[PDB]
Design a protein around this motif. Structure first.
Motif, mmCIF file in Angstrom:
data_model
loop_
_atom_site.group_PDB
_atom_site.id
_atom_site.type_symbol
_atom_site.label_atom_id
_atom_site.label_comp_id
_atom_site.label_asym_id
_atom_site.label_seq_id
_atom_site.Cartn_x
_atom_site.Cartn_y
_atom_site.Cartn_z
ATOM 1 N N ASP A 141 0.881 -1.090 0.000
ATOM 2 C CA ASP A 141 0.000 0.000 0.000
ATOM 3 C C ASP A 141 0.966 1.194 0.000
ATOM 4 N N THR A 142 0.360 2.363 -0.394
ATOM 5 C CA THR A 142 1.121 3.567 -0.615
ATOM 6 C C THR A 142 0.550 4.681 0.174
ATOM 7 N N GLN A 143 -0.662 4.531 0.802
ATOM 8 C CA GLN A 143 -1.141 5.589 1.698
ATOM 9 C C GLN A 143 -1.350 4.913 3.044
ATOM 10 N N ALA A 195 1.422 3.007 3.863
ATOM 11 C CA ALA A 195 2.843 2.789 3.964
ATOM 12 C C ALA A 195 3.406 3.856 4.883
#
Lengths: 169, 89
Positions: free
Chosen positions: A120-122, A124
């Motif tokens: 995941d990037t949000q 993370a």
């Protein structure tokens, strides 16, 4: 948000892009004991025990260990059924842990979906380590087998119904 | 003292020239190499395929040549993890 995700960002986008499901979730969610822990002494001495775990209970009789924590699998689980419609499961984790359980409390860390700085990037950024299960759907169909398990008396499993969506038990 | 059966293909000489940037050198006119990006997958098509000679040369194909994730994921820590996760698969 988009491009490639675990199962964690799927679930967020689901709730994002509808608001009648998001409200439905909020309805169901909206509406103390002192336990020294430990087992496995008294069990080997009368008869067998032979391996330590609460999976010994599940190979046969649920009388095989201490029977004043056989007490706790009814009673503190009853407290847990008031709690889950008062919201959360990590609340129920903290009480499962006083219930003299410490490997059957792993099932309430199981309920977490994969939240990761690898997929995941949000998510993370409020986590910098791996969280949950990325086999969360095989977790769901395996904690759903316990909801019907007939070796499991109703005072354990009714929360295992609910962890995979609640049959009225 | 070197008896590899896939030296005896001269097209395998030619594969090793193409994974190489040939250097017009300026101390001496003779060729050198500016950049060796030499692959260990260039003998995995001439080698026999059962042998831990094949598994040896394959292990360096995962480790001593790169492995990357194709398309950009949004954070750098995540992008970099997916090179190491691809390499890990």
């Amino acid at each position: 948000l988009h491009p490639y995700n675990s199962r964690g960002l799927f679930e967020k986008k689901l709730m994002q892009d509808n608001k009648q499901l998001y409200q439905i979730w909020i309805v169901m969610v909206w509406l103390p004991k002192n336990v020294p822990t430990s087992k496995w002494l008294n069990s080997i001495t009368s008869g067998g025990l032979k391996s330590c775990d609460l999976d010994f209970p599940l190979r046969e009789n649920t009388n095989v260990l201490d029977v004043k924590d056989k007490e706790e699998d009814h009673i503190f689980f009853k407290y847990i059924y008031e709690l889950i419609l008062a919201g959360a499961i990590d609340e129920a984790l903290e009480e499962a842990k006083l219930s003299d359980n410490i490997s059957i409390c792993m099932i309430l860390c199981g309920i977490q979906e994969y939240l990761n700085p690898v997929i995941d990037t949000q998510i993370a950024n409020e986590f910098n380590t791996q969280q949950g299960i990325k086999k969360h759907s095989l977790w769901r169909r395996t904690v759903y087998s316990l909801s019907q398990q007939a070796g499991l008396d109703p005072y354990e499993r009714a929360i295992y119904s609910y962890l995979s969506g609640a049959i009225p038990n | 003292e070197l008896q590899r059966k896939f030296l005896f293909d001269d097209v395998y000489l030619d594969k090793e020239i193409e994974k190489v940037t040939i250097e017009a050198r300026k101390s001496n006119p003779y060729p050198q190499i500016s950049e060796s990006s030499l692959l260990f997958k260039d003998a995995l098509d001439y080698m026999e395929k059962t042998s831990s000679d094949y598994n040896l040369w394959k292990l360096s194909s995962i480790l001593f040549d790169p492995v990357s994730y194709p398309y950009k994921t949004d954070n750098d820590q995540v992008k970099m993890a997916l090179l190491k996760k691809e390499r890990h698969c």
